[PDB]
């Protein structure tokens, strides 16, 4: 080796008797590693080889054995000691050249491995929210890099004989008691792989929607576990095949993992926290682009839909509120409720847009109406706004008979708006009930409005 | 009994030692550090509650020192040991705790190589009690793609060599073979991605950066070629024989590739030239020059025009003409940027500068000199012009410009 071999051997008097022991003393083993031979000349290779980077201080079942080759070795635990650098710096600590492993040697690895990658992936997000430490693209790759990585390490986390028992196997009393806990298995997998959408709030849909992700998740590590497969292994060495195809098949966590990793990933790509007419538009314009996902049932992508259209409809109604709207002069209602108007003229063109591509799916065979017709609704509610807001603007354009017209006209549109605002379920019932007093308002202005 | 809340400093301040302590314990430095309050009750969940760091940042800025929680995050010269891994506490006191040593720094990157290289050698040796199941072998490939990509971050903050960090080690199963393929089919990618147009596009577009920027593809293309000749291996042409179009696809490009650097190491001879011409200009302390550099600049382009006829296979003769231009561009603004600035500003302030703003006149003079002997070396050259200065130069002319419409109102100003 180099001339540092002091404080390495020193280290491993430290350390070897920590690893390969409860406390106590190191049998040496580096000097009957160094007076046999290949040991001492290995260990030379550690220190001071740029090529094998790499060492092992393998424990073995007390033997101790220093050696590169890797052999896993029950029942010991370990420390491994790799330099990596060419000529083992004896101007500097034997700690500070080579990077310490403690090893389990058959014993709980692939945990201990998991955990350490989930540590290495939280110092790798903490880098990436300070500086550099990845550049440009190079590090906006890096960042992709770990964002694998830790995709892998929550893979890891998700993964943490069959004649072992002799005459215990063939019993009615035990593989009955088995066959009815993976049936009973079978009835809790079906509770959470059918409710109705019914109305709504956006973060409900999406919440469900990522509680499905996680419990489906959760419930496929609890089936990933290796007792709860060798029980279905149990049971189908035993050929009681009718709780064993009868848990798989009829749980359908096959299809309903990947309808719950559907609605996880419509989440991830998704109003209501909205107060501006400005922020209600661009609401709207957010929603209607993370909706394009769409090739990537026709019946689970309305449903959704319609859950978004409800939220919008209950923000509409809770501005014009905020906007006492037969107090406020009609001229600063309108500058208001025209960038109302202008969403509602967006939201009017996506359904023409939606319309079409159900017209493509009629033309190629020879539930989905009710909610094109509750959008059609929402789209004609958001334009009666937007004439009433138009109406006050030109008023104030013009002439004092026609300013106290438009006034009139403010002031009965701000409590059809207030109505809405009070209750959702109202917004609904009450809407249908202001169209047919609005006729009637409308008739008494258009009188005023002639003379 | 050991220890519990203490048991973990104890034994963590023998292992740490910085190669000869072995104290085992009573840190006096370590109880004094205790009462952060998050890290105590961090320390007290790692002892007899699976993961416990015990940070050393030395120097730097905003060191930590004798810092660290249970999880939390360094930013340091750390060690996390486990401590009854969900809970083996309140029993034997902690056996199946598990120590690693986390120096200062990369270094977080060659940690995960080694831990990849001890998984691998995990999988290698029992196969596990169905914790790994058959996701050791996938854990494995995990694993590998993990050490390309920080191999491709190794490249990013280096040069390159992608390819050889995607070829797999100690390969003894068709599938795998596929999987290095389908990694030395990004590192082709990679070739082809760089552009010298892509860096004229995001400012820049400097003499010496462009010549710079050849000098680094070739380099990347040489080092390519010379990981090419290690790539095939007598193994590796094995695999893409049973089964091929995926093989002859990563052949093709990589031809493609040895051809493409025999035209960057000519592009890299005409880079080295140009690296001397840039040379001249970046050595400039922006003081004078332009009287000079007017002078200079004539023979600069009778060197580039020279440089067409003596390569001649130069691959990309009418792209590196927008490099070229781009070039003696960016050049001319960092001059003009010099002489006027806060200086300008300055000088109009004051009122008492006539001849300054003559100077400026003269600095718009030497851009003349470039264009004219840009057309001085059109005629010389005689056919094969290219330049297309009348979009190219448009970021010059632009520039002078404005300078003009200065030195128009400048002048006016001294009237008055």
Known sequence: ?451 | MGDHSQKDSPEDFIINRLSQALGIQKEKIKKSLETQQDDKGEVTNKDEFIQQDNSTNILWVSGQSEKCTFYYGQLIDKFKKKGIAIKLGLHKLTNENVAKDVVVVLLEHLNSVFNEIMSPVMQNPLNQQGWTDLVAKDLMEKFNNYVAQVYVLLGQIKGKTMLPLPSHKLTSKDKAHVFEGSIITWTKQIKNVLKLEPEQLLKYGNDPGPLAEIEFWQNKRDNLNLIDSQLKSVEVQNILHFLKSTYTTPFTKLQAEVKKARLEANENYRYLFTLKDLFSKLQESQPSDFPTLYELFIPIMHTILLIYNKSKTYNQPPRLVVLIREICNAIISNAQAFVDKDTIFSLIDSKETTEACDKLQVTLDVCSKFKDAYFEYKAKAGGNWKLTSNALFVRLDSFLERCQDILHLTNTIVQF
């Open chain 1, 1 to 451: 080796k180099y001339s540092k071999r002091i404080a390495w051997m020193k280290t491993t008097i430290c350390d070897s008797l920590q690893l390969k022991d409860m406390i106590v003393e190191e049998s040496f083993q580096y000097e009957k590693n160094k007076n046999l031979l290949e040991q001492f000349l290995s260990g030379e290779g550690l220190n001071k080889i740029f090529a094998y980077y790499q060492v092992q201080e393998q424990a073995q079942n007390t033997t101790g054995d220093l050696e590169k080759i890797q052999d896993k070795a029950v029942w010991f635990l370990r420390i491994t000691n790799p330099a990596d650098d060419k000529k083992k710096a004896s101007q500097q600590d034997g700690n500070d050249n080579d990077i310490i492993f403690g090893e389990i040697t058959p014993n709980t690895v692939p945990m201990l491995n998991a955990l350490m990658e989930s540590v290495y992936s939280r110092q790798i997000d903490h880098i990436i929210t300070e500086k550099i430490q990845f550049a440009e693209e190079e590090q906006v790759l890096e960042f992709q890099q770990h964002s694998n990585k830790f995709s892998s390490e929550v893979r890891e986390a998700i993964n943490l004989l069959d004649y072992e028992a002799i005459s215990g196997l063939s019993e009615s009393e035990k593989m009955q008691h088995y066959e009815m806990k993976f049936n009973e298995w079978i009835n809790l997998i079906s509770s959470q792989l059918r409710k109705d959408e019914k109305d709504a709030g956006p973060a409900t849909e999406l919440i469900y929607w990522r509680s499905r992700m996680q419990k489906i998740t959760n419930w496929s590590e609890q089936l990933k576990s290796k007792d709860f497969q060798i029980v279905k292994a149990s049971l189908q060495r035993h050929k009681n095949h009718d709780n064993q195809r009868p848990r798989g098949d009829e749980s359908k966590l096959n299809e309903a993992k990947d309808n719950v990793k559907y609605l996880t990933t419509l989440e991830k790509f998704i109003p209501l926290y909205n107060g501006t007419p400005q922020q209600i538009i661009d609401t709207l314009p957010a929603l209607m682009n993370a909706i394009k996902m769409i090739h990537t049932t026709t019946d689970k992508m309305t449903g959704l839909f319609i859950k978004i259209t409800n939220q919008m409809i209950k923000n509409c109604k809770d501005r014009i509120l905020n906007k006492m709207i037969w107090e406020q002069d009609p001229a600063e209602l309108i500058e208001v409720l025209g960038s109302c108007i202008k969403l509602y003229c967006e939201y009017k063109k996506c359904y023409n847009d939606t319309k079409e591509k159900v017209a493509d799916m009629p033309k190629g065979k020879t539930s989905d109406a009710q909610i094109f017709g509750k959008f059609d609704t929402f789209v004609r509610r958001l334009q009666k706004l937007i004439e009433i807001f138009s109406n006050i603007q030109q008023f104030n354009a013009l002439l004092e008979g026609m300013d106290v017209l438009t006034n009139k006209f403010k002031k009965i549109i701000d409590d059809f708006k207030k109505k809405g605002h009070n209750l959702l379920d109202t917004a609904n019932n009450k809407f249908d009930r202001d169209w047919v007093e609005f006729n009637v308002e409308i008739s008494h202005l258009d009188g005023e409005l002639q003379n």
